Amino acid sequence: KVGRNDPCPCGSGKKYKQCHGR
User: Bridge-partner residues for 7, per DSSP?
Assistant: 15
Q: Per-residue x/- mask for Zn ion, residues 1 to 22, rule CB under 5 A?
A: -------x-x-x------xx--
Closest to Zn ion by CB, 4 or 19: 19
CB of 6 to Zn ion, least distance (A): 11
CB of 17 to Zn ion, least distance (A): 10
Q: Exposed, middle or buried, 16 (CB in 10 Å: 0-12/13-18/19+)?
A: middle
CA dist list (Å): 11 to 3, 5, 19: 14, 14, 10
Binding site residues, Zn ion, CB under 5 A: 8, 10, 12, 19-20
